[PDB]
Design an enzyme around this catalytic site. Sequence first.
Site, PDB file in Angstrom:
ATOM      1  N   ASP A 104       0.853  -1.177   0.000  1.00 31.44           N
ATOM      2  CA  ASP A 104       0.000   0.000   0.000  1.00 31.44           C
ATOM      3  C   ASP A 104       0.889   1.227   0.000  1.00 31.44           C
ATOM      4  O   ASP A 104       1.471   1.574   1.027  1.00 31.44           O
ATOM      5  CB  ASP A 104      -0.911  -0.034   1.207  1.00 31.44           C
ATOM      6  CG  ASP A 104      -1.955   1.030   1.176  1.00 31.44           C
ATOM      7  OD1 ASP A 104      -1.865   1.951   0.354  1.00 31.44           O
ATOM      8  OD2 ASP A 104      -2.886   0.940   1.976  1.00 31.44           O
ATOM      9  N   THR A 105       0.989   1.888  -1.148  1.00 27.69           N
ATOM     10  CA  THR A 105       1.732   3.136  -1.246  1.00 27.69           C
ATOM     11  C   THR A 105       1.002   4.320  -0.636  1.00 27.69           C
ATOM     12  O   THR A 105       1.610   5.371  -0.428  1.00 27.69           O
ATOM     13  CB  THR A 105       2.034   3.429  -2.699  1.00 27.69           C
ATOM     14  OG1 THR A 105       0.807   3.669  -3.391  1.00 27.69           O
ATOM     15  CG2 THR A 105       2.756   2.266  -3.341  1.00 27.69           C
ATOM     16  N   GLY A 106      -0.268   4.181  -0.344  1.00 34.58           N
ATOM     17  CA  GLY A 106      -1.017   5.214   0.319  1.00 34.58           C
ATOM     18  C   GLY A 106      -0.942   5.182   1.811  1.00 34.58           C
ATOM     19  O   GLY A 106      -1.550   6.030   2.456  1.00 34.58           O
TER      20      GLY A 106
HETATM   21  C1  LIG Z   1      -7.015   0.378   4.169  1.00 33.07           C
HETATM   22  C2  LIG Z   1      -6.753   0.031   2.710  1.00 33.07           C
HETATM   23  C3  LIG Z   1      -7.064  -1.445   2.463  1.00 33.07           C
HETATM   24  C4  LIG Z   1      -7.682   0.856   1.799  1.00 33.07           C
HETATM   25  N1  LIG Z   1      -7.398   2.306   1.838  1.00 33.07           N
HETATM   26  C5  LIG Z   1      -6.209   2.832   1.144  1.00 33.07           C
HETATM   27  C6  LIG Z   1      -5.024   3.153   2.055  1.00 33.07           C
HETATM   28  O1  LIG Z   1      -3.882   3.384   1.239  1.00 33.07           O
HETATM   29  C7  LIG Z   1      -5.285   4.402   2.904  1.00 33.07           C
HETATM   30  C8  LIG Z   1      -5.213   5.742   2.173  1.00 33.07           C
HETATM   31  C9  LIG Z   1      -5.432   6.904   3.110  1.00 33.07           C
HETATM   32  C10 LIG Z   1      -6.692   7.129   3.673  1.00 33.07           C
HETATM   33  C11 LIG Z   1      -6.912   8.200   4.536  1.00 33.07           C
HETATM   34  C12 LIG Z   1      -5.872   9.065   4.858  1.00 33.07           C
HETATM   35  C13 LIG Z   1      -4.623   8.855   4.299  1.00 33.07           C
HETATM   36  C14 LIG Z   1      -4.403   7.791   3.426  1.00 33.07           C
HETATM   37  N2  LIG Z   1      -4.303   4.427   3.981  1.00 33.07           N
HETATM   38  C15 LIG Z   1      -4.530   4.120   5.271  1.00 33.07           C
HETATM   39  O2  LIG Z   1      -5.607   3.956   5.785  1.00 33.07           O
HETATM   40  O3  LIG Z   1      -3.320   4.018   5.898  1.00 33.07           O
HETATM   41  C16 LIG Z   1      -3.287   4.094   7.323  1.00 33.07           C
HETATM   42  C17 LIG Z   1      -2.018   3.423   7.858  1.00 33.07           C
HETATM   43  O4  LIG Z   1      -0.994   4.335   7.561  1.00 33.07           O
HETATM   44  C18 LIG Z   1      -1.472   5.627   7.916  1.00 33.07           C
HETATM   45  O5  LIG Z   1      -1.033   6.593   7.008  1.00 33.07           O
HETATM   46  C19 LIG Z   1      -2.108   6.945   6.126  1.00 33.07           C
HETATM   47  C20 LIG Z   1      -3.390   6.608   6.858  1.00 33.07           C
HETATM   48  C21 LIG Z   1      -3.018   5.520   7.841  1.00 33.07           C
HETATM   49  S1  LIG Z   1      -8.730   3.353   1.955  1.00 33.07           S
HETATM   50  O6  LIG Z   1      -8.257   4.713   1.687  1.00 33.07           O
HETATM   51  O7  LIG Z   1      -9.397   3.080   3.220  1.00 33.07           O
HETATM   52  C22 LIG Z   1      -9.869   2.919   0.639  1.00 33.07           C
HETATM   53  C23 LIG Z   1     -10.748   1.864   0.859  1.00 33.07           C
HETATM   54  C24 LIG Z   1     -11.643   1.488  -0.140  1.00 33.07           C
HETATM   55  C25 LIG Z   1     -11.652   2.207  -1.343  1.00 33.07           C
HETATM   56  C26 LIG Z   1     -10.760   3.297  -1.547  1.00 33.07           C
HETATM   57  C27 LIG Z   1      -9.854   3.654  -0.540  1.00 33.07           C
HETATM   58  C28 LIG Z   1     -11.010   3.879  -2.954  1.00 33.07           C
HETATM   59  C29 LIG Z   1     -12.531   3.580  -2.964  1.00 33.07           C
HETATM   60  C30 LIG Z   1     -12.505   2.061  -2.612  1.00 33.07           C
HETATM   61  O8  LIG Z   1     -11.922   1.302  -3.649  1.00 33.07           O
END
Ligand SMILES: CC(C)CN(C[C@@H](O)[C@H](Cc1ccccc1)NC(=O)O[C@H]1CO[C@H]2OCC[C@H]21)S(=O)(=O)c1ccc2c(c1)CC[C@H]2O
Lengths: 99, 99
Positions: free
Chosen positions: A25-27
Site C-alpha cells: 500500500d503506497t497510500g
Molecule cells: C485500508 C486500505 C485497504 C484501503 N485504503 C487505502 C489506504 O492506502 C489508505 C489511504 C489513506 C486514507 C486516509 C488518509 C490517508 C491515506 N491508507 C490508510 O488507511 O493508511 C493508514 C495506515 O498508515 C497511515 O497513514 C495513512 C493513513 C493511515 S482506503 O483509503 O481506506 C480505501 C478503501 C476502499 C476504497 C478506496 C480507498 C477507494 C474507494 C474504494 O476502492
Amino acid sequence: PQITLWKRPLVTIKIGGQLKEALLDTGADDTVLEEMNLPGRWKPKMIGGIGGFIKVRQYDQILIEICGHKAIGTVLVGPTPVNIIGRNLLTQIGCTLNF
Amino acid sequence: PQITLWKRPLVTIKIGGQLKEALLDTGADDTVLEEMNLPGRWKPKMIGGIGGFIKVRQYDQILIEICGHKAIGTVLVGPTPVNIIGRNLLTQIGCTLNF
Ligand SMILES: CC(C)CN(C[C@@H](O)[C@H](Cc1ccccc1)NC(=O)O[C@H]1CO[C@H]2OCC[C@H]21)S(=O)(=O)c1ccc2c(c1)CC[C@H]2O
C-alpha cells in the site's frame, strides 16, 4: 518482482514466525496488521483512515520478511480490515512506482 | 517516472479544470477526492476503509490528467482525509510496483 495493479498487490509476508498475506500500500505511511501475538514491548497509538480512526498497538523493531526481502521497522497491530505494508517498510525493500 | 517511497507519493492532478494534489495509492481500488464541484450527474455510494465507511458521490467517465498522463474513469467525491488515486486510474497511466 515488478507488479501490475489489475489485481490487488498482495504478497506473502513472514512475521513472528507466521505466514500471512499483506497489501503493498503506497497510500499508507505505516504498516498495520490484523490482530496477532507479536512478541516484545509496545505502546498504545491511534491511526486514522477514510472511515475514521482505530486504536492500535505500536511495536518497534519488528522483523518482517516481505516476499523474501527482509526489513525491520515499526509494525502496528489493530482492528484493520486488511494487513497493509506501508511506506515505512516499502522503502527498506526498495519498492518504487513506475509509469 | 520512477518514484521512491521515502516520502508520500504525491502528484499533481488536473480535474474539472482545477488543480489538485493526490496520493498514488496502490492500496485503493478506486479514486476518491476531497469535496469539490465536479460537473454532471452522480450516484450516492458507500465506501469503507480503516475506521469504517463514508458516503460519497460517484462520477463516471471523468477525465483526470495525472502528472501529465490523461485517464478517464470513475471518481468518487466525499469526506476523504486526502485525495487518493486508486487502481482504477493507476492502471490507465501504466503504473507498476517494482522491487
Ligand atoms: C485500508 C486500505 C485497504 C484501503 N485504503 C487505502 C489506504 O492506502 C489508505 C489511504 C489513506 C486514507 C486516509 C488518509 C490517508 C491515506 N491508507 C490508510 O488507511 O493508511 C493508514 C495506515 O498508515 C497511515 O497513514 C495513512 C493513513 C493511515 S482506503 O483509503 O481506506 C480505501 C478503501 C476502499 C476504497 C478506496 C480507498 C477507494 C474507494 C474504494 O476502492
